[PDB]
Design a protein around this ligand. Structure first.
Ligand SMILES: Nc1ncnc2c1ncn2[C@@H]1O[C@H](COP(=O)(O)OP(=O)(O)O)[C@@H](O)[C@H]1O
Ligand SMILES: Nc1ncnc2c1ncn2[C@@H]1O[C@H](COP(=O)(O)OP(=O)(O)O)[C@@H](O)[C@H]1O
Ligand SMILES: [Mg+2]
Ligand SMILES: [Mg+2]
Lengths: 359, 359
């Protein structure tokens, strides 16, 4: 009977953004679950509390929905779940192995949040309508809610993956979900192949791929970076699925089926990935709506592919944009930060500032 | 001693947006300066008053500057200038020929507004600094101020050009500044040639041009539209100058000098023009600043080429965007509305809504 108390307390702190370097040293040298354990015991409760504090200030008409209420209960339970370790002592090789098991259990407990929240969006649409204002509010809330979730899952995956149990491997290519030497083109190739498979099965035809690299400072060196490869895969995959669908459907009474071209450019601070297709394009007017949760609610189904992929890009100070040419095709660009130094977590925070965005 | 009275009165009305069709019929059939005269006598004072009402609510620290004060005096005089005809009778072939002369005199009186206002921006920068907030406010104000000016000059040019004196020509290709059959590629070609000339004189080297059309519905028909060609020329010219400078300066220790490629695509509602260069690109972080009046204050000099070109595009419901690839190049896209029906003036209005954007 004290969750409201915990929430209000940790709701006083601000989340602490970690850089890609800190993440690397967290699993590298300093790496002793004790250091991580002591960090996550306070950090997770601060991040959970902050997003929960935001939820509770939602209109009661949204608040009371079975969707929001159910999800809101998982976060309350997860908070209390991690609390158990606030007073424990980390020298006990069993106190921290229970923390690891506690994390894995919290992660899977939230595994269906997107679909669940999506259901609440649909109810609202039929219960109150889809007006620019309610859309802006939902968009504002979901973008922050989901970004927060991405950051929390990152902390948990880094801990669970890194402390699997003993250091046999000792010295790895990867540090949890992070690859200090990620070959961008390879990930492009992978996401493409997976999309192609789906495309062939459903349309029994699929455009090919062309890749071009532009290493500004070192003309012919392959482009590598420090990043979370699974995150990059997700964005590329969602983009490849859209490009394929459009290209195929727009050339049905045509035999020709142009390829999808990808360019990977590396500058002094940006690492840019552009995916160009000829799937007919979209009118500038409808582009804005493609990133909407409300308005966007085989290969395609719901409308979370674009908006959530953007959040992944933004997570480490990057971005994802779309510019099309109705009657021809579309360019989708993923902007990432080239230097591990500029790669720092972007986290939404609860303040008097975040309060008036709902007024 | 009654300008404040006039301002407050006409400040009660909202400007009336005209469609490209109305503009065409205004000079076409209905066309009788009497019809235009009676329209402009009330419309101009409503548009002048609305922008003047906005100026007067500017912080006194901006208000009091010689710049703003001087410009503010021209608009006050122009208002009183047109007022003279509020009680006159239009059957007098001399009452309306004095209106025409009155317009030409008002147009030239405001011919140096941009430079003058720019001077006020520079003073503010050194007098109070360049912080995100003061920048946002200035940007907000200037975008509206200038759009308003573009709309007023459009009305005046349509009247003066159309009623030059007698209908010798009787039946023209053009209706004032509007071309009901504008060949986009031709205007592209013209702006390119003018930019090339300047580029050659200053750098004694210039990239070439390639043009590609994509007529979705009619594969090989040349792309025509109803538009104000001088406006399109201006945007293309400013874009060509940037693309040329960048391309040349970024390949100085290179002999190769890649071309500037332009694509003109015509869809069901959009007519898009993309200009692609290989001038090295810009970091995503600095792109935002390129459209700033404050932050942007040979070929290039001041920083009004981009922001003002965007206003021209927005004027008839279009847009102008920039997306770059640091280490490679940049894409600049002009979005226009394909159908004359969707081509309607976009005008800023003074309301309680426009008031709180300065708070
Ligand atoms: N490259 C593209 N060309 C044309 N339309 C596109 C493209 N990418 C996305 N879209 C449009 O945007 C919408 C997709 O957003 P998304 O969030 O990925 O969901 P989904 O693909 O499951 O419908 C599509 O439904 C499609 O109408
Ligand atoms: N295609 C481009 N490639 C690289 N930089 C560009 C490009 N277009 C514009 N810029 C940058 O944006 C700025 C220009 O904005 P603009 O308002 O046109 O003013 P100006 O060209 O007179 O400086 C330039 O000063 C340049 O630094
Ligand atoms: Mg998709
Ligand atoms: Mg310029």
């Amino acid at each position: 009977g004290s969750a409201p108390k915990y929430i209000e307390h940790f709701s006083k702190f601000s989340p602490s953004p970690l850089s890609m370097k800190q993440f690397l040293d967290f699993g590298s040298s300093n790496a002793c679950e004790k250091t991580s354990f002591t960090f996550l015991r306070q950090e997770l409760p601060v991040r959970l509390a902050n997003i929960m504090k935001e939820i509770n200030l939602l209109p009661d008409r949204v608040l009371s929905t079975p969707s929001v209420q159910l999800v809101q209960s998982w976060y309350v339970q997860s908070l209390l779940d991690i609390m158990e370790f606030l007073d424990k002592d980390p020298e006990d090789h069993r106190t921290l192995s229970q923390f690891t098991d506690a994390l894995v259990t919290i992660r899977n407990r939230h595994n269906d949040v997107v679909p669940t929240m999506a259901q609440g969006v649909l109810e609202y649409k039929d219960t109150y309508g889809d007006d620019p204002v309610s859309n802006q509010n939902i968009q504002y809330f979901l973008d922050r809610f989901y970004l927060s979730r991405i950051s929390i899952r990152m902390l948990i995956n880094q801990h669970t993956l890194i402390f699997d149990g003993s250091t046999n491997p000792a010295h790895p290519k990867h540090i949890g979900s992070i690859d200090p030497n990620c070959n961008v083109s390879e990930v492009v190739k992978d996401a493409y192949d997976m999309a192609k498979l789906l495309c062939d099965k459903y349309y029994m035809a699929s455009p090919d791929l062309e890749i071009q690299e532009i290493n500004a400072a070192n003309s012919k060196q392959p482009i590598h970076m420090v990043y979370v490869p699974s995150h990059l895969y997700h964005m590329l995959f969602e983009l490849f699925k859209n490009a394929m669908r459009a290209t195929v459907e727009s050339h049905e009474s045509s035999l020709i089926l142009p390829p999808i071209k990808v360019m990977v450019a590396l500058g002094e601070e940006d690492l840019s990935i552009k995916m160009s297709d000829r799937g007919g394009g979209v009118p500038l007017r409808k582009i804005e709506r493609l990133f909407s949760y409300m308005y966007s609610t085989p290969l395609a189904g719901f409308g979370y592919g674009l908006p959530i992929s953007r959040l992944y890009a933004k997570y480490f100070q990057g971005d994802l944009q779309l510019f099309s040419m109705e009657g021809f095709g579309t360019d989708a660009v993923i902007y990432l930060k080239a230097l591990s130094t500029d790669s720092v977590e972007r986290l939404p925070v609860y303040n008097k500032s975040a309060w008036r965005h709902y007024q």
